[PDB]
């Protein structure tokens, strides 16, 4: 069937005297063939317009400052990860035993190994603080 040959930004029209037609406003077709253009996603409420919607691409969504896009195609706005945890695929998860993040918008990096530098573990570390070393 001819509709296979419709390029992105068009949809296969049933109207005769035309195989395809260009996507209506506020609707996109990122692949060729589609019998219908999909409605452009709105970046409103708790979202913000990163990229605009073209007849060939959806609008890409962005998050407020102090927040980050969480989820497939930014289907969430998670708040920037607090001290003592790192941002993972499945949102904001706490640091593992033996690692720490002592800041906001940070990443869990392992505790200092005091012995490695001929030192001893004066104070142990938490999920939010590093091991304080002492002499051996």
């Amino acid at each position, epitope marked *: 069937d001819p509709c296979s040959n419709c390029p992105a930004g068009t949809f296969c029209d049933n109207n005769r005297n035309q195989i395809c037609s260009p996507c209506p406003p506020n609707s996109f077709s990122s692949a060729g063939g589609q019998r219908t253009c999909d*409605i452009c996603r709105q970046c*409103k409420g708790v979202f913000r317009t990163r990229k605009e919607c073209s007849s060939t691409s959806n609008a890409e969504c962005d998050c407020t400052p102090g927040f980050h896009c969480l989820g497939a*195609g930014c289907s969430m706005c998670e708040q920037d990860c607090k001290q003592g945890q790192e941002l993972t695929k499945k949102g904001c998860k706490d640091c593992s035993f033996g690692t720490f993040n002592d800041q906001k918008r940070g990443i869990c990096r392992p505790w200092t190994d005091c012995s490695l530098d001929g030192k001893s573990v004066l104070v142990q570390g938490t999920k939010e603080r590093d091991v304080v070393c002492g002499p051996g």
Partner: antibody
Amino acid sequence: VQLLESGGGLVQPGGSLRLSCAASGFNFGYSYMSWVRQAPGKGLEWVSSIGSTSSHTYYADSVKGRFTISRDNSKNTLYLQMNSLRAEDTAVYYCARVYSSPGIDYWGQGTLVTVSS
Amino acid sequence: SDIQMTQSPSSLSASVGDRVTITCRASQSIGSTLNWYQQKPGKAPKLLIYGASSLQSGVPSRFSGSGSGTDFTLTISSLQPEDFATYYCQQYYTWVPFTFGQGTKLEIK
């Protein structure tokens, strides 16, 4: 966190009401406020929304040019000026808040708007 | 004109202790921009699931949201007495307007 709807009641078609929602226990200023109605027996239909910015007023097709959403972030109050009220408008109206999650987390108890066909 | 949410089934009889599976179908791919609500008669709705999968604070782990694209399912394991209500699925893909499902009523035998 609380949301208290008022101003609903029984009106003749063509008439008007002013709904009010009283917020407390959160930052009203930084909340995307909405009205969602539910006619008796039926489900939930979005009515209107207003951004934290208070410059963006959005409306459902059926209430465009009749209803008007407004907010007074000083008195932490949301309003719905419902004019030219039709029979189809008979419903319980709820004020609903989106804070940081994309889902509506806090709803009010509702206020009943009734039209006498 | 706009995005159509279609829940399946309209009504569902189930006995306590079971696991339930409500469907919600979006008229087009909407990624994971889906919410789940529970409404008990006379009371206002309550947010269960936001972003198709994550739970709101307070909701028990027996309620689990899944799906991406068109087909989404709310699953309630170990049906509990207080879990008998009408459930609604909402989309926030479009904010003007956000659209809800017709609702699925969960009942007893």
